């Protein structure tokens, strides 16, 4: 199997920057290489065919080049909508092999999250369980710390986080943290709080509510 060694695995650059993604084919594959762009939850889209030909409809800022066994995809002026995982593919021999992919992230100015807290619904409480949700909206960088405190007790092992993929227009992330307790455990406490630590915040922000 001809390996397509893609590098780097991840990449972060500002808008307007020139980004270069390389694939070193372990064997000669002449110009039989294609480049694909994959947005989260979507099918890959063809960018470059035959190592250097721009596929119809693809912006001119994308370019492909071959230099022996090394192939490159260049985005001359990185745009916010270029957040995606890029993959090279050789089709010289069977099996057609894909590179491991390159995750391209867009650098932007620091943006503090807007924090929101959501108590469990009465419908869910009736059903005997309590989920408390904390939302961190539109922030940059991705690194954020969310701590749950139930009557000042730091919670551990009873919450789960989810982070959205970078926004294609404003380059921010969003995060949800869900604290799960039984209705019985939930009714034994009063203040439910989520404390957020982020680069855009002077000091940690706390959002909370009193049960009732």
């Amino acid at each position: 199997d001809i390996q397509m060694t893609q590098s780097p695995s991840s990449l972060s650059a500002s808008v307007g920057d020139r980004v270069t993604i390389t694939c070193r084919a372990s064997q000669d594959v002449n110009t039989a290489v294609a480049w694909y762009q994959q947005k989260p939850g979507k099918a890959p889209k063809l960018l470059i065919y035959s190592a250097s030909f721009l596929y119809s409809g693809v912006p001119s800022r994308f370019s492909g080049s071959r230099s022996g066994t090394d192939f490159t995809l260049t985005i001359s002026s990185l745009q916010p909508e270029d957040f995606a995982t890029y993959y090279c593919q050789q089709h010289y021999t069977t099996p057609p092999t894909f590179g491991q992919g390159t995750k391209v992230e867009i650098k932007r100015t620091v943006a503090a999250p807007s924090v929101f807290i959501f108590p469990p619904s009465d419908e869910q409480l009736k059903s005997g369980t309590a989920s408390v949700v904390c939302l961190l909206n539109n922030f940059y960088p991705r690194e954020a710390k969310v701590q749950w405190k139930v009557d000042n007790a730091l919670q551990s092992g009873n919450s789960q986080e989810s982070v959205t993929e970078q926004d294609s227009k404003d380059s921010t992330y969003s995060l949800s943290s869900t604290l799960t307790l039984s209705k019985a455990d939930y009714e034994k406490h009063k203040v439910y709080a989520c404390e957020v630590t982020h680069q855009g915040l002077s000091s940690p922000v706390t959002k909370s509510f009193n049960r009732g």
Binding site: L46, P95, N137
Partner: protein, 220 residues
């Protein structure tokens, strides 16, 4: 030109499943058809290919002896028969063509079909509102949403106001809870002044259990 996959879903380990790839706007007899898969959070992996006119096929070593690709040229459809499915076969399966004037790359792909190889069973989601409150405001902007909980297998889709509300919407990637069931929230930031005036309804769809839920999210 369009490629449309169907047939994905939950199947037990050792089980069998046949995926379909219905092509339109072109003749599959003129092109090669490929199957490419992607495990959750992983990269792309070519699985199989066929030349429908003469039925010549090729497979990846990871699926050889268990998967079979075929085609019905009158129906303009290709198939992926999967036998003895393993947990490692869980992935979104895409079909693709090798076409054009001289592209010889995969120019058109299908939307994909998720195949879950698990001994667990189907659970529809429980949908609860994430009500906008005084604790869900931030200077003229309120947040509201829906918690889509305890479903299996993936996926679920969420939309707001039948697709009329898209800006400010964030549907989070599902997470697997300790129970082995998925959970996610879909939130939207709206003007605080719209709370008692605009109606907000989340439309949840869980095709694996034929479930469609429309939950109205009211302040309180």
């Amino acid at each position: 030109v369009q490629l449309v996959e169907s047939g994905g879903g939950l199947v037990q380990p050792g089980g069998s499943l046949r995926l379909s790839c219905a092509a339109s706007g072109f003749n599959i007899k003129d092109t090669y058809i490929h199957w490419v898969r992607q495990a959750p959070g992983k990269g792309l992996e070519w699985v199989a290919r066929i030349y429908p006119t003469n039925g010549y096929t090729r497979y990846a070593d990871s699926v050889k002896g268990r998967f079979t690709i075929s085609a019905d040229t009158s129906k303009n459809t290709a198939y992926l028969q999967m036998n003895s499915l393993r947990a490692e076969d869980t992935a979104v399966y895409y079909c693709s063509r090798w076409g054009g004037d001289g592209f010889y790359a995969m120019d058109y792909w299908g939307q994909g079909t998720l195949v879950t190889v698990s001994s667990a069973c189907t659970k529809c989601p429980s949908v609860f509102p994430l009500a906008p409150s005084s604790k869900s405001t931030s200077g003229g902007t309120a947040a509201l949403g829906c918690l889509v909980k305890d479903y299996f297998p993936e996926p679920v889709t969420v939309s707001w106001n039948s697709g009329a509300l898209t800006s400010g919407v964030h549907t989070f990637p599902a997470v697997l809870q300790s129970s082995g069931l998925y959970s996610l929230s879909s939130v939207v930031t709206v003007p605080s002044s719209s709370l008692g005036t605009q109606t907000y309804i989340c439309n949840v769809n869980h095709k694996p259990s034929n479930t469609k839920v429309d939950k109205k999210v009211e302040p309180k």
